[PDB]
């Protein structure tokens, strides 16, 4: 009685475009074109697909199948699979928090640009502003200029001294105080996700119609726009020129694997939640297949969208697009790409749809990000919770604002990197490995093939079987070992992070991980019996 059976989605296309909305984000736009053109160019497509087929797709489809089959949250599903690994559901809840502290501040920057892009003369065109230094040298100014080590462009000056105000902080040590503009921007973001999540899957699923389709439109406008620019073939040459020798490096495969994993994002509980609210009779194999193939191809065309404008920018400057595309991160889109689109007719248009496109890219993904955690807590503490959804949703949203207050600082950008590199990647890889191993090895991949066989009507192929049993946990294990062995020294804006950052990072990387061995200790520590007896009753799910 009472609630009993769970709710169901409003249409097939909503959940298709919804999982597509989670899959597609900023990184699809600029991360993949950079990592592609840097690691052997077009040849990077060869391992990228392999790491997709053997790694990303199986985790994606396994996660999705479990989600639609068991209809449980990220915490409650472990109660009915492997209770000792229930802490996994908790770990994600912490991980997501760390992500929601920086991912939306980027959307706040794109939002600050968007509202600052309504003026007839764009701010980052002239140097006669209140934030530019004496180094600021700009165009529509005398030709022959010969750039100096200390000179700075109006776009770099605008991004550095205004929207970030990063010159007012010395690094991780001193980063305060808070830029209230980005606080209001990210507040508006938390509002626009508040009215798109608070109701549940119906609103996220309806806002997704806009947040997942518009990026293709803006990418299409900047695509046909960037294609008509003179000398844009340079960026395409640098973008797709095959350099097969780079394929001999054992690093490149690692980069491809990490890319496809962190662009499909399986085992994060978001796909579990998005899959939970669907029909048991409804097919999901085709769903997972098509959805991934969209995320990959969308990245492929996004490469052109970036490197066409970068090619035109390298033509107006002096070629070897790599030099104009050295820095990967927020500067490739907020400085180089913005300064590139500044010299184009009706620049207000392309600017508005560009930064609006950035916000539109982050919105759907963060919808899904929150959706997974919300589903997990509501399903884990029912009746004690579900009293209202706006209460718990409001709680997690304002929590994400207070979490971003460290990021809204002057040196917030610094923290963004520290959180983007150190915290998420190793832990997420770990929980994906433990999750995959627990579904494929503990629960038994045989019974999983029986669950899919009861789901779609047919048992999954021997390919999916061997991928889940061996190829996928080895796929995650590869990136785990390669990551731990060579953690990266990182620098941002002529500032090398202190030697101790990794320590801090490891804290932020493990402070979220402590819950699973301590929960195994809590489970095995709480029920008396013998060690062999209690772990045998704790590995087998509920019989009824």
């Amino acid at each position, epitope marked *: 009685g009472s609630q009993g059976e769970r709710e169901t989605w409003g249409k097939k296309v909503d959940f298709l475009l919804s999982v597509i909305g989670y899959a597609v984000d900023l990184g699809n736009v600029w991360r993949f074109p950079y990592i592609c053109a840097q690691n052997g160019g077009g040849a990077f497509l060869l391992p990228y697909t392999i790491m997709a087929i053997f790694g990303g797709i199986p985790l994606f489809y396994m996660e999705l199948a479990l989600g639609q089959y068991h209809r449980n949250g990220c915490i409650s599903i472990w109660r009915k699979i492997c209770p000792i690994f229930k802490g996994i559901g908790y770990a994600i809840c912490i991980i997501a928090f760390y992500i929601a502290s920086y991912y939306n501040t980027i959307m706040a920057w794109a939002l600050y640009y968007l509202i600052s892009s309504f003026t007839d003369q764009l701010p980052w065109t002239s140097c006669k502003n209140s934030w530019n230094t004496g180094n600021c040298t700009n165009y529509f100014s005398e030709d022959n200029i*010969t750039w100096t*080590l200390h000179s700075t462009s109006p776009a770099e000056e605008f991004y550095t001294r205004h929207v970030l105000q990063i010159h007012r902080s010395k690094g991780l040590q001193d980063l305060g105080g808070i830029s209230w503009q980005l606080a209001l921007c990210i507040m508006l973001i938390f509002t626009v996700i508040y009215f798109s999540i608070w109701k549940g899957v119906k609103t996220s699923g309806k806002v997704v119609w806009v947040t997942a389709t518009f990026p293709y439109i803006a990418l299409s406008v900047l695509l046909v726009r960037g294609a008509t620019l003179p000398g844009a073939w340079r960026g395409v040459l640098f973008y797709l020129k095959p350099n097969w020798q780079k394929l001999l490096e054992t690093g490149v495969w690692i980069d491809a694997a990490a890319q496809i994993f962190f662009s499909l994002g399986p085992g994060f509980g978001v796909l579990l939640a998005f899959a939970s609210y669907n029909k048991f009779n409804n097919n999901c194999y085709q769903d997972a297949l098509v959805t991934s193939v969209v995320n990959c191809m969308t990245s492929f065309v996004s490469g052109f969208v970036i490197f066409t404008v970068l090619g035109y920018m390298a033509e107006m400057r002096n070629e070897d697009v790599s030099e104009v595309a050295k820095d990967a991160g927020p500067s490739l889109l907020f400085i180089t790409y913005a300064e590139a689109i500044a010299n184009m007719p009706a620049s207000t248009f392309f600017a508005i749809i560009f930064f609006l496109m950035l916000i539109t890219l982050g919105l759907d993904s963060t919808f899904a990000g929150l959706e997974g955690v919300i589903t997990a807590v509501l399903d884990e503490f029912p009746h004690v919770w579900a009293k209202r959804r706006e209460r718990f949703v409001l709680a997690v949203v304002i929590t994400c604002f207070f979490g971003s207050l460290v990021t809204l600082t002057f040196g917030g950008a610094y923290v963004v990197k520290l959180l983007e590199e150190y915290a998420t990647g190793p832990a997420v890889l770990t929980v994906a490995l433990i999750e995959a191993v627990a579904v494929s090895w503990f629960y038994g991949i045989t019974q999983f093939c029986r669950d899919v066989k009861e789901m779609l009507g047919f048992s999954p192929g021997w390919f999916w079987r061997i991928c889940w049993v061996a190829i996928s946990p080895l796929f995650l294990l590869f990136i785990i070992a390669s990551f731990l062995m060579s953690p990266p020294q990182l620098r941002l804006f002529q500032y090398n992070y202190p030697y101790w950052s990794i320590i801090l990072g490891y804290a932020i990387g493990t402070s979220s991980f402590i819950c699973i061995p301590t929960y195994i200790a809590y489970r095995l520590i709480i029920t008396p019996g013998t060690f062999k007896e209690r772990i045998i009753k704790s590995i087998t799910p509920e019989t009824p």
Partner: antibody
Amino acid sequence: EVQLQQSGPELVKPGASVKISCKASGYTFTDYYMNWVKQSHGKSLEWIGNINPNNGGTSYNQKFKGKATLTVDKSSTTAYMELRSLTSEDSAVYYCTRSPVRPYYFDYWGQGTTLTVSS
Amino acid sequence: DIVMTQSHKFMSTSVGDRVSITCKASQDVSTAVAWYQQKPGQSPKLLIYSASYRYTGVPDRFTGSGSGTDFTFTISSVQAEDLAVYYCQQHYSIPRTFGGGTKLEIKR
């Protein structure tokens, strides 16, 4: 005006090391890249690498990686290039030349440094 | 990398004649070629940058042209002191490479 006074000629036995200086003057030293070009007897110019005087930002050539080591000192506005594993091919004239960051031309050069690697 | 090829190692000219040295690059360069003048016993002296622009302190008798891959250095009034070895160098892709060097010998 702008002057790049290099060091004198050096006669060094093969297998040893040799360091060449480059006293820069007449401009804001921190405002320009400091480059090193190799010129073999009867050969063309050969770009060794550059260095950012502010932080010692060395950007070498794959052909000279591990062959030359560029350093810089702001306290005296002087850039140095050290060479190890000296052979008969290194017996060439070396120049230190100033360059902006873009466009990357070599506006001012040094007088050259005659290096002879022989026992 | 980039291979700057000066097919003609030597070129003969006279005082007052119109002389022009060619320069072939590996790939498309747009307008990123600089011409240097190394007089026998002196350091290379910068004459042209970015294909056509002249550098400061260079007489009007030195000009540059070309747009794409092949570029040309022109002297209208050759003087007795214009006797030198001319090099061409690209300035767009890392690393920066030079030409083989064209010695300009004067005929009298």
